[PDB]
């Protein structure tokens, strides 16, 4: 019945190589973007006009994340380090060292005093924002870590890895509260808490997205139709309007599902390469999507629903 009508409004060009991750700022004013060209770029969330090029990393960047006040940024790079940036100045505050291998993902806690990171060293590290000190190193997985994310109060961490595991961690103690397993054990490429922090959206490299309850280890919804077997693609909850599931795909399309009926309601066409990242605006029905090497651009989409 009710479907969204997302429409291309802007194409954000300027990145030299493949774009890896796009994230909206909490205040909904800005949009950050990480790429394989070792750069981070800031854009206007509403008109998509370029604002600032921020650099420092010696190798490509796979993920970027905002602080709660939209004043800071953190980046996960292949130079085995993370770097905290002041968005206003675009300068390296602190550089987080200790991962010993490719840093793949990163996130702030809602208090923005902690930073979680996942790397190819099969570990999850909890960093201290003001000091840059690594507070804890979680031996989370036995394969590259694909995603890390806090919950609404920042009391929990969720992690995913190519070992096919999804682990929920107690932020305070660093202990593992629960492990979500699949008997087939396909690689989990992305995990994310729901806005209410009661559910977990997990992506596996068998072209499948699943909505998890994590109080009980029970799968509620299952979303298919898209293509995902090789890349770690971001997925999102769309709550600002209708309740949708948004995700990039390997057939260069942005798939949108109905969260309840699990049906595909829209497929955004326009990208030239695999859509690796998707992001939803905090207050507006706006979707930001980015693609790989054959499509070094970012696209903004707006809907009335």
């Amino acid at each position: 019945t009710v479907k969204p009508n997302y429409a291309l409004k802007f194409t954000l060009a300027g990145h030299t190589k493949a774009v890896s991750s796009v994230k909206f700022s909490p205040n909904g004013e800005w949009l950050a973007s990480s790429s394989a060209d070792k750069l981070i770029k800031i854009w206007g969330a509403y008109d998509g006009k370029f604002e600032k090029t921020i650099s420092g990393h010696k190798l490509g960047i796979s993920d970027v994340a905002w602080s709660s006040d939209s004043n800071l940024l953190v980046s996960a790079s292949d130079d085995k380090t993370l770097k905290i940036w002041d968005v206003s100045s675009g300068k390296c505050l602190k550089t987080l060292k200790g991962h010993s291998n490719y840093v793949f993902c990163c996130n702030f806690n809602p208090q923005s005093n902690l930073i979680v990171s996942g790397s190819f060293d099969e570990s999850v590290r909890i960093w201290d924002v003001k000091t840059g000190k690594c507070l804890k190193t979680l031996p989370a997985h036995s394969d590259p870590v694909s995603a890390v994310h806090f919950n609404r109060d920042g009391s929990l961490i969720v992690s995913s890895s190519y070992d096919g595991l999804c682990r929920i961690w107690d932020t305070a103690s660093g202990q593992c509260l629960k492990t979500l397993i699949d008997d087939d054990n396909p690689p989990v490429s992305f995990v994310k808490f729901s806005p209410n922090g009661k559910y977990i959206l997990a992506a596996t490299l068998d072209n499948t997205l699943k909505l998890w309850d994590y109080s009980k280890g029970k799968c509620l919804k299952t979303y298919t139709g898209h293509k995902n077997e090789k890349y770690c693609i971001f997925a999102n909850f769309s709550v600002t309007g209708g309740k949708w599931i948004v995700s990039g795909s390997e057939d260069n399309l942005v798939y949108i599902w109905n969260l309840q009926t699990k049906e595909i309601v829209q497929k955004l066409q326009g990208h030239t390469d695999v859509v690796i990242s998707t992001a939803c605006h905090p207050t507006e029905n706006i979707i930001a999507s980015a693609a790989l090497e054959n499509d070094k651009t970012i696209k903004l989409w707006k809907s009335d629903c």
Partner: protein, 96 residues
């Protein structure tokens, strides 16, 4: 056929262990995965990891007199832009 690594062989051996080695490719490996089990056996396969910096390994805890299938996977890692996976593996058979 093409495979990474190449020239997988048995350097030395005991009745219950194997010393294997291979050519370290010009391209650098993030880490190796070495799987081994009984040749044609229904029993599942044991596996462990090896850093892409070293090109040798020792497989212990084997049974004497039985055919074993050794397989080495060479994973190439990187950022989100490159898909994480392995080149075509290489396999050899050996009787302890």
């Amino acid at each position: 056929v093409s495979s990474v690594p190449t020239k997988l062989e048995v350097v030395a051996a005991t009745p219950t262990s194997l010393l294997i080695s291979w050519d370290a490719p010009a391209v650098t490996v993030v880490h190796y995965v070495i799987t081994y089990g009984e040749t044609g056996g229904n029993s599942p396969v044991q596996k462990f990891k090896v850093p892409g910096s070293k090109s040798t390994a020792t497989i212990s805890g084997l049974k004497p007199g039985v055919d074993y299938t050794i397989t080495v996977y060479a994973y190439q890692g990187g950022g989100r832009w490159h898909p994480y996976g392995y080149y075509s593996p290489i396999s050899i058979n050996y009787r302890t």
